[PDB]
Every structure is written in C-alpha cells, then in structure tokens.
Write an enzyme that holds these catalytic residues in place. Structure first.
Site, PDB file in Angstrom:
ATOM      1  N   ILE A  20       0.808  -1.213   0.000  1.00 32.27           N
ATOM      2  CA  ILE A  20       0.000   0.000   0.000  1.00 32.27           C
ATOM      3  C   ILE A  20       0.842   1.264   0.000  1.00 32.27           C
ATOM      4  O   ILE A  20       0.288   2.364   0.089  1.00 32.27           O
ATOM      5  CB  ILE A  20      -1.005   0.020   1.170  1.00 32.27           C
ATOM      6  CG1 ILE A  20      -0.261   0.008   2.508  1.00 32.27           C
ATOM      7  CG2 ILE A  20      -1.952  -1.163   1.068  1.00 32.27           C
ATOM      8  CD1 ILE A  20      -1.165   0.074   3.722  1.00 32.27           C
ATOM      9  N   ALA A  22       5.335   2.901  -0.128  1.00 32.35           N
ATOM     10  CA  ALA A  22       6.773   2.708  -0.039  1.00 32.35           C
ATOM     11  C   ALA A  22       7.273   3.441   1.195  1.00 32.35           C
ATOM     12  O   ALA A  22       6.905   4.598   1.427  1.00 32.35           O
ATOM     13  CB  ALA A  22       7.478   3.236  -1.286  1.00 32.35           C
ATOM     14  N   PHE A  25      13.003   2.980   3.269  1.00 31.10           N
ATOM     15  CA  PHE A  25      13.824   1.921   2.686  1.00 31.10           C
ATOM     16  C   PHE A  25      13.108   0.593   2.939  1.00 31.10           C
ATOM     17  O   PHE A  25      13.508  -0.246   3.746  1.00 31.10           O
ATOM     18  CB  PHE A  25      15.259   1.910   3.214  1.00 31.10           C
ATOM     19  CG  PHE A  25      16.213   1.161   2.325  1.00 31.10           C
ATOM     20  CD1 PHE A  25      16.781   1.780   1.223  1.00 31.10           C
ATOM     21  CD2 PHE A  25      16.529  -0.161   2.581  1.00 31.10           C
ATOM     22  CE1 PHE A  25      17.657   1.099   0.403  1.00 31.10           C
ATOM     23  CE2 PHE A  25      17.403  -0.848   1.761  1.00 31.10           C
ATOM     24  CZ  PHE A  25      17.967  -0.215   0.672  1.00 31.10           C
ATOM     25  N   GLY A  26      12.026   0.406   2.207  1.00 33.34           N
ATOM     26  CA  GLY A  26      11.132  -0.709   2.423  1.00 33.34           C
ATOM     27  C   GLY A  26       9.785  -0.376   1.823  1.00 33.34           C
ATOM     28  O   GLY A  26       9.589   0.676   1.218  1.00 33.34           O
ATOM     29  N   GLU A  27       8.855  -1.297   2.015  1.00 31.94           N
ATOM     30  CA  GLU A  27       7.483  -1.110   1.579  1.00 31.94           C
ATOM     31  C   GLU A  27       6.565  -1.008   2.787  1.00 31.94           C
ATOM     32  O   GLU A  27       6.911  -1.421   3.896  1.00 31.94           O
ATOM     33  CB  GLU A  27       7.024  -2.275   0.697  1.00 31.94           C
ATOM     34  CG  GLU A  27       7.538  -2.217  -0.726  1.00 31.94           C
ATOM     35  CD  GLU A  27       9.003  -2.564  -0.828  1.00 31.94           C
ATOM     36  OE1 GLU A  27       9.469  -3.405  -0.034  1.00 31.94           O
ATOM     37  OE2 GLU A  27       9.698  -2.000  -1.698  1.00 31.94           O
ATOM     38  N   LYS A  42       5.065  -1.429   8.001  1.00 31.47           N
ATOM     39  CA  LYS A  42       6.161  -0.782   7.293  1.00 31.47           C
ATOM     40  C   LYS A  42       7.452  -1.548   7.544  1.00 31.47           C
ATOM     41  O   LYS A  42       7.821  -1.780   8.701  1.00 31.47           O
ATOM     42  CB  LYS A  42       6.341   0.674   7.728  1.00 31.47           C
ATOM     43  CG  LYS A  42       7.467   1.369   6.971  1.00 31.47           C
ATOM     44  CD  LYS A  42       7.355   2.886   7.016  1.00 31.47           C
ATOM     45  CE  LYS A  42       8.029   3.463   8.253  1.00 31.47           C
ATOM     46  NZ  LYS A  42       8.194   4.934   8.138  1.00 31.47           N
ATOM     47  N   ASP A 135       4.256  17.841   9.236  1.00 35.83           N
ATOM     48  CA  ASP A 135       3.523  17.519   8.009  1.00 35.83           C
ATOM     49  C   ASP A 135       2.060  17.242   8.309  1.00 35.83           C
ATOM     50  O   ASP A 135       1.466  16.297   7.786  1.00 35.83           O
ATOM     51  CB  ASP A 135       4.163  16.334   7.277  1.00 35.83           C
ATOM     52  CG  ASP A 135       3.678  16.185   5.842  1.00 35.83           C
ATOM     53  OD1 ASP A 135       3.053  17.128   5.317  1.00 35.83           O
ATOM     54  OD2 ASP A 135       3.930  15.120   5.235  1.00 35.83           O
ATOM     55  N   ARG A 139      -4.191  14.386   4.516  1.00 34.55           N
ATOM     56  CA  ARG A 139      -3.663  13.148   3.956  1.00 34.55           C
ATOM     57  C   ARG A 139      -2.941  12.304   5.001  1.00 34.55           C
ATOM     58  O   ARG A 139      -2.726  11.108   4.774  1.00 34.55           O
ATOM     59  CB  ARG A 139      -2.718  13.448   2.786  1.00 34.55           C
ATOM     60  CG  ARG A 139      -1.400  14.093   3.193  1.00 34.55           C
ATOM     61  CD  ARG A 139      -0.575  14.525   1.985  1.00 34.55           C
ATOM     62  NE  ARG A 139      -0.244  15.940   2.083  1.00 34.55           N
ATOM     63  CZ  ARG A 139       0.771  16.422   2.787  1.00 34.55           C
ATOM     64  NH1 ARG A 139       1.630  15.624   3.399  1.00 34.55           N
ATOM     65  NH2 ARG A 139       0.923  17.739   2.889  1.00 34.55           N
ATOM     66  N   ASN A 140      -2.566  12.893   6.140  1.00 33.40           N
ATOM     67  CA  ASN A 140      -1.858  12.186   7.199  1.00 33.40           C
ATOM     68  C   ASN A 140      -2.741  11.880   8.409  1.00 33.40           C
ATOM     69  O   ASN A 140      -2.217  11.640   9.504  1.00 33.40           O
ATOM     70  CB  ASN A 140      -0.634  12.988   7.645  1.00 33.40           C
ATOM     71  CG  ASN A 140       0.574  12.755   6.765  1.00 33.40           C
ATOM     72  OD1 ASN A 140       0.800  11.647   6.281  1.00 33.40           O
ATOM     73  ND2 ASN A 140       1.371  13.799   6.568  1.00 33.40           N
ATOM     74  N   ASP A 153       1.542   9.861  10.319  1.00 33.60           N
ATOM     75  CA  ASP A 153       2.500  10.481   9.406  1.00 33.60           C
ATOM     76  C   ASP A 153       3.017   9.412   8.456  1.00 33.60           C
ATOM     77  O   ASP A 153       3.765   8.517   8.864  1.00 33.60           O
ATOM     78  CB  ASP A 153       3.660  11.131  10.158  1.00 33.60           C
ATOM     79  CG  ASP A 153       4.575  11.918   9.245  1.00 33.60           C
ATOM     80  OD1 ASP A 153       4.346  11.915   8.016  1.00 33.60           O
ATOM     81  OD2 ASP A 153       5.523  12.555   9.746  1.00 33.60           O
TER      82      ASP A 153
HETATM   83  C1  LIG Z   1       2.669   0.986   9.457  1.00 33.22           C
HETATM   84  C2  LIG Z   1       3.017   2.369   9.942  1.00 33.22           C
HETATM   85  C3  LIG Z   1       4.328   2.704  10.270  1.00 33.22           C
HETATM   86  C4  LIG Z   1       4.678   3.983  10.655  1.00 33.22           C
HETATM   87  C5  LIG Z   1       3.707   4.966  10.750  1.00 33.22           C
HETATM   88  N1  LIG Z   1       4.050   6.181  11.387  1.00 33.22           N
HETATM   89  C6  LIG Z   1       3.221   7.190  11.745  1.00 33.22           C
HETATM   90  O1  LIG Z   1       2.028   7.218  11.458  1.00 33.22           O
HETATM   91  C7  LIG Z   1       3.828   8.263  12.594  1.00 33.22           C
HETATM   92  C8  LIG Z   1       5.194   8.542  12.615  1.00 33.22           C
HETATM   93  C9  LIG Z   1       5.679   9.584  13.388  1.00 33.22           C
HETATM   94  C10 LIG Z   1       4.807  10.352  14.142  1.00 33.22           C
HETATM   95  C11 LIG Z   1       3.444  10.079  14.141  1.00 33.22           C
HETATM   96  C12 LIG Z   1       2.486  10.910  14.938  1.00 33.22           C
HETATM   97  F1  LIG Z   1       3.088  11.908  15.590  1.00 33.22           F
HETATM   98  F2  LIG Z   1       1.553  11.478  14.170  1.00 33.22           F
HETATM   99  F3  LIG Z   1       1.831  10.197  15.855  1.00 33.22           F
HETATM  100  C13 LIG Z   1       2.962   9.030  13.368  1.00 33.22           C
HETATM  101  C14 LIG Z   1       2.401   4.667  10.378  1.00 33.22           C
HETATM  102  C15 LIG Z   1       2.050   3.377   9.991  1.00 33.22           C
HETATM  103  N2  LIG Z   1       0.919   3.051   9.354  1.00 33.22           N
HETATM  104  C16 LIG Z   1       0.304   3.293   8.188  1.00 33.22           C
HETATM  105  N3  LIG Z   1      -0.997   3.007   8.029  1.00 33.22           N
HETATM  106  C17 LIG Z   1      -1.532   3.172   6.801  1.00 33.22           C
HETATM  107  C18 LIG Z   1      -2.981   2.886   6.651  1.00 33.22           C
HETATM  108  C19 LIG Z   1      -3.609   2.985   5.411  1.00 33.22           C
HETATM  109  C20 LIG Z   1      -4.971   2.763   5.301  1.00 33.22           C
HETATM  110  C21 LIG Z   1      -5.675   2.439   6.441  1.00 33.22           C
HETATM  111  N4  LIG Z   1      -5.106   2.325   7.648  1.00 33.22           N
HETATM  112  C22 LIG Z   1      -3.788   2.546   7.734  1.00 33.22           C
HETATM  113  N5  LIG Z   1      -0.875   3.595   5.706  1.00 33.22           N
HETATM  114  C23 LIG Z   1       0.410   3.885   5.908  1.00 33.22           C
HETATM  115  C24 LIG Z   1       1.087   3.784   7.114  1.00 33.22           C
HETATM  116  C25 LIG Z   1       2.417   4.160   6.813  1.00 33.22           C
HETATM  117  N6  LIG Z   1       2.545   4.455   5.540  1.00 33.22           N
HETATM  118  N7  LIG Z   1       1.312   4.292   4.981  1.00 33.22           N
HETATM  119  C26 LIG Z   1       1.086   4.566   3.573  1.00 33.22           C
END
Ligand SMILES: Cc1ccc(NC(=O)c2cccc(C(F)(F)F)c2)cc1Nc1nc(-c2cccnc2)nc2c1cnn2C
Length: 272
Positions: A20, A22, A25-27, A42, A135, A139-140, A153
């Site tokens: 879903i 990138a 350095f990974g998916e 991630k 950020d 979108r976040n 994020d």
């Molecule tokens: C797996 C993972 C690993 C790391 C992070 N890190 C943070 O959120 C982060 C980092 C720093 C500070 C903070 C904050 F300060 F804000 F808290 C938050 C999020 C997720 N998770 C995701 N989830 C979904 C997703 C999609 C559709 C439905 N549900 C979920 N798409 C994602 C990602 C990651 N990429 N994408 C495209």
C-alpha cells in the site's frame, strides 16, 4: 531502551498481503496480525543504512510512547528479526482527505467540528510531548468506523506549512498550528485543495501579501475565526493547541454556537 514503550511482535504473527506504499527503505503493506486484526506494516529491507536504522527504530520508539485516542496506535515492532517492521492499527475508512472528497456533503456541521476537536486533541498531546509533526495535513489523518480521527505520518507541503518553517526551517508546535488551520479548512470544505490552482510560489506570495483562504461554504463563524487566527504571520500570536481544543470543545458542547455562519463570498453571480 529506544523501544521501551513498544511491544516486540514475533514474525510468525504477521502476514503481509498487499503493498500500500513505499517506506524510506522498504514497503508499507496491509496485512493481518494474530494475537486476526487488520494492520498496516512498514518494513526496513536489507541494505538500510545506519541513519535509516536510527530513524526507523526511533520512529517506532516515539510511536510506542504515544497513547491517545486521536493518535495512530502502534501494535508493535519487529526489531530482532529481518526485515524489521513497524506495525500499526488499520482503518478501513482510510485517509481523511480522500474520505472527505468521496463523501461530499454527507456529514453534519457537528460531525465535522467533532473531527476537528479530535485532531486538535491529538495535536495538543503531541505538542505537550514535545513532538513537532511538521507535516500535518488531511492526507496524514486516518478515520476509524466511529469517525474518530487519528493523527499519523506517512511521509512526504508548501500549502500546509507556516511561513517561518518555509523561510528558515523553524518547525515548532506553532507551525503545526498553522497547518492545523489548513486542516480545518480541508475538513469544512470536504477536502478541497488549499488555494486551488495557485502554484507554490503564488501561495507564498499571497500569504506574504496578507491574503488568506476565504471561508468555506456553510461554515460556522466561530470556526472560520479560529482557523484565521491559526494563520497569523507572527508565530507568537497564534493560539496554542490548548486554546484550540478548549474552543472546539466549548462550541460542540453548546452546539447552538455553530448555527451562526460566516458569510460566503460568491465567486459566481447567478441572477434569476
Ligand atoms: C505501518 C506504519 C508505520 C509507521 C507509521 N508512522 C506514523 O504514522 C507516525 C510517525 C511519526 C509520528 C506520528 C504521529 F506523531 F503522528 F503520531 C505518526 C504509520 C504506519 N501506518 C500506516 N498506516 C496506513 C494505513 C492505510 C490505510 C488504512 N489504515 C492505515 N498507511 C500507511 C502507514 C504508513 N505508511 N502508509 C502509507
């Protein structure tokens, strides 16, 4: 110690299913976690650098520290095996910007303002924890099945960024407040593009010349007043997140306060 607030998950509990996104350095994958719960995953794939490892485990560690209704929940981390992974909850409704745009006009003012209260409460928590987001944008933000917004994020935003952060990289909670004002406008417009077709340079020139985004349609006066004060050029004059949460809470709890609407400036005349 970096992972002191996190649970270590064993790889046998994780099933990756679809890519879903990138990572650095990974998916990023959608998958399942047994302990089945849908999750986002991630990875940090073979060949990552020292800096990438520090940033990746540092991200995992800060996320483990966060425990708040409006912050994405970390399920756990895989650090003892390769590939390393960060595993979070998954929201079927997805990201807020796409969600709004696909549901134009489907919510009440109270529902929209409630979303903003939740985002603000999450940001108040982050700022209090001394975490600068940098950020913040629809979108976040993820939306769960109770309409609860979770600040997240996903990585890489001139249009959302405060002037001091653009001009000299001064990112603070107060530049996050500017971004929050933009998010308020995103929510109340059902995901419109801030500044529409203006280019990035045109947006910065407009802001420096004193222009600000106009009111959304059908927007409570108090809500537009609040987003406008998030966009004060002088960082020190902007509300703190505590002020934003308090105002949004009070407006929701006295909901007649939201019935007074700001005038919408028509961009088109229709005479009949
Ligand atoms: C797996 C993972 C690993 C790391 C992070 N890190 C943070 O959120 C982060 C980092 C720093 C500070 C903070 C904050 F300060 F804000 F808290 C938050 C999020 C997720 N998770 C995701 N989830 C979904 C997703 C999609 C559709 C439905 N549900 C979920 N798409 C994602 C990602 C990651 N990429 N994408 C495209």
């Amino acid at each position: 110690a970096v992972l002191k607030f996190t649970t270590e998950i064993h790889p046998s509990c994780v099933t990756r299913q679809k890519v879903i996104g990138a990572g650095e350095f990974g998916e990023v994958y959608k998958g399942m976690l047994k302990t089945e719960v849908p999750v986002a995953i991630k990875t940090l794939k073979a060949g990552y650098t020292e800096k990438q490892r520090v940033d990746f485990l540092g991200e995992a560690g800060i996320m483990g520290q966060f425990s708040h209704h409006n912050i994405i929940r970390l399920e756990g981390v895989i650090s003892k095996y390769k590939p390393m992974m960060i595993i979070t909850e998954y929201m079927e409704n997805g990201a807020l910007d796409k969600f709004l745009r696909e549901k134009d006009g489907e919510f009440s003012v109270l529902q929209l303002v409630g979303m903003l209260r939740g985002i603000a409460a999450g940001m108040k928590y982050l700022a209090n924890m001394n975490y600068v987001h940098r950020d913040l944008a629809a979108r976040n933000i993820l939306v769960n099945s109770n309409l609860v917004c979770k600040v997240s994020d996903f990585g890489l935003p001139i249009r959302w960024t405060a002037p001091e952060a653009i001009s000299y990289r001064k990112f603070t909670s107060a530049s996050d407040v500017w971004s929050f004002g933009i998010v308020m406008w995103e929510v109340m417009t059902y995901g419109e593009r801030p500044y529409w077709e203006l280019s990035n340079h045109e947006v910065m020139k407009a802001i420096n010349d004193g222009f600000r985004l106009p009111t959304p349609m059908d927007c409570p006066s108090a809500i537009y007043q609040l987003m406008m004060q998030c966009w004060q050029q002088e960082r020190a004059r902007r509300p703190k997140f505590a002020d934003i949460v308090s105002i949004l809470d009070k407006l929701i709890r006295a909901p007649d306060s939201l019935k007074t609407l700001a005038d919408f400036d028509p961009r088109v005349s229709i005479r009949l």
